[PDB]
Design a protein around this ligand. Structure first.
Ligand SMILES: Nc1ncnc2c1ncn2[C@@H]1O[C@H](CSCC[C@H](N)C(=O)O)[C@@H](O)[C@H]1O
Ligand SMILES: Nc1ncnc2c1ncn2[C@@H]1O[C@H](CSCC[C@H](N)C(=O)O)[C@@H](O)[C@H]1O
Lengths: 349, 350
């Protein structure tokens, strides 16, 4: 994990996100009252970009914490820009560090694929509960996860890739039975499962299109970063989305994304609320795109149809930074109430 | 990190799909069933259990198939389904933490990574030999061998056109970060650069070389006797010399490394027939290891009789012990000694 974040090359990818960058930019400077002459802790500074803007905008002192050797660059960068007298870049895992003082603002960019991937917010919680004074602000102040039924040609690409996978495995076992004389038949099933788990069962990074969304989007979890806790991170949700097309569409899968907001405390508000969304757009991509969850079996669907969804979202056992999505779906026609029930496990890795 | 990959049938599959590698091992066994007829066999890192199966097919008394990964499950089912469970015993664990109901006649295993030495799976085979093999014991393969040879390849252009791309993209990036956001990224121009050279240039590429692309005499850098090879023998120094052949006129663009493996058994129990598995430049024979290429930072002209005096030093990286580093020091001397043109570059295998 920490591995990939130690590359300049990876770090600039993020910095290249104009959408990602504009939001934090405008959140800081359009609200330089949370910063003027205050103390900020930038959580997971990496390049130290967010930690520079805070100083640039009035922060008396800014603790920029980075777990990787990337810290050594955030230093040259904060020093090369003449803010070394404000920003203190400390290398090390925020979980293991002690500060001299409590902090007014915690600023971080902890959001992953589908928001919860990487579980870096667990570090921010630690930082907030250990340091944020009783009256501190947080950037972002709230977050939000969304889901919606979509219609993509990728559903078929991946079924066509699994089918091929399966076509090859059967030539190969024929080959190995002719020469060598070993019969590979009984590993057909395990090679099946391992393959549905990879082309079908595992969420795809896609760049959805507003026109690909075929129902009302649902909010699958709201969040308050001033108050959220790790215990509430593994999450269960039930809601409903309605078809709006002719429909003359099929259910090919579900897309998931997230909202983020810079609003302030209900009591130290933002002069101006800034929103970073990843909702599909014809123009604004993010490096997060959306997570497409592909349909093992596409389904016909008409307008007015009513998709009752039951999501359950737990962090994996092998690796707590990966997700596993349990998705139960009872579809109901406009008229109550036929159905097309089914249950599917998707993996965010 | 390492083992993770081998728990994948799809991967185990790639290797089993490698005809050259299979033909070699399959023949090694059946052309020599005299080591296997009624013998006890240890297979180290069984995977699908393919070597265990053949051994048992060749009349072994009992076979021992050790896999670290949950793949042991499938070798175990793969051996039941071929009516060999009464001879083959698939065990789950590391050959380092496992004990045996007895000593073993033959130790067969496919432990060779990229450029022979990657993954360092031989450490496990050794351990397996030292504790379990009996004096009489034979080993498959019985010898190994790493080679090196100066080459001519358009990939040394491909990568530097790649690097330049990278650099160009950065200088725009930084200019775009200053225009909006008001940060100058200048102090990171050099570090960015080194990362990009470390990654495009100094890092070994997989390649499938044509024998024509070999512009000098090859050279043996290391030769291995699996019966006696130590783990300390595994960090390696090698000073060779090579002579440019094509050399009417070509360009030095980098180096290729590859390995040989041999199944000759023992001098007091020799193979009825010796089998070989080579990864040299082929024209008609491919392998999943291919050849490892080490690019020239800067390509150099070269002629007939030009003498490449190479100083090599193979060692493992501090971070991971399964990865390699190669300090390659090069003195080039024209057929008329000298004058020179000497360089020094450390290459990473990952
Ligand atoms: N517990 C922890 N302590 C310190 N740094 C952490 C951390 N968990 C994640 N990080 C770091 O936080 C960074 C998140 S990526 C964000 C980069 C930068 N803040 C920006 O917005 O441009 C990574 O560089 C990662 O190394
Ligand atoms: N110390 C160890 N103990 C058990 N298995 C090991 C091991 N080190 C490596 N392996 C396993 O050995 C295999 C190496 S690839 C060999 C696959 C198979 N024997 C064949 O020849 O086709 C991998 O499955 C790896 O997981």
């Amino acid at each position: 994990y920490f591995c990939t974040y130690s590359f300049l090359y990876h770090q600039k990818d993020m910095l290249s996100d104009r959408v990602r960058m504009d939001a934090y930019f405008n959140a800081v400077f359009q609200n330089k009252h949370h910063f003027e002459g205050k103390t900020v802790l930038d959580v997971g500074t990496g390049s130290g970009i967010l930690a520079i803007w805070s100083a640039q905008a009035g922060a008396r002192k800014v603790y920029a914490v980075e777990a990787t050797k990337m810290a050594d660059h955030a230093r040259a960068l904060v020093k090369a820009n003449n803010l070394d007298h404000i920003v203190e870049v400390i290398e090390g895992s925020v979980e293991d560090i002690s500060l001299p003082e409590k902090v007014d603002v915690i600023i971080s960019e902890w959001m992953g694929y589908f928001l919860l991937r990487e579980s870096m917010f667990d570090s921010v919680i630690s930082a907030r509960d250990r340091w944020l004074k009783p009256t501190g602000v947080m950037y972002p102040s709230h977050a939000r996860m969304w889901l919606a039924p979509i219609k993509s040609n990728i559903a078929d690409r991946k079924r066509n890739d699994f089918d091929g996978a399966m076509a090859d495995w059967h030539n190969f076992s024929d080959e190995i039975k002719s020469y060598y004389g070993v019969d590979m038949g009984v590993l057909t099933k395990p090679f099946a499962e391992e393959q549905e788990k990879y082309y079908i069962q595992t969420a795809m990074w896609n760049d959805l299109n507003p026109q690909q969304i075929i129902g009302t989007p649902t909010i699958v979890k709201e969040m308050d970063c001033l108050t959220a806790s790790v215990s509430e991170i593994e999450e269960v949700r039930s809601n409903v989305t309605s078809v709006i097309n002719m429909e003359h569409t099929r259910l090919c899968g579900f897309g998931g994304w997230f909202d983020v907001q810079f609003s302030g405390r209900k009591e130290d508000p933002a002069q101006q609320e800034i929103e970073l969304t990843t909702a599909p757009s014809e123009q604004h991509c993010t490096h997060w795109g959306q997570q497409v969850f592909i349909m093992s079996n596409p389904i016909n669907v008409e307008e007015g149809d009513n998709l009752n969804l039951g999501l359950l979202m737990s962090r994996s056992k092998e690796n707590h930074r990966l997700m596993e999505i349990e998705l139960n779906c009872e579809i109901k026609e406009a008229s109550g109430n036929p159905k097309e029930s089914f249950k599917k496990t998707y993996f965010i890795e």
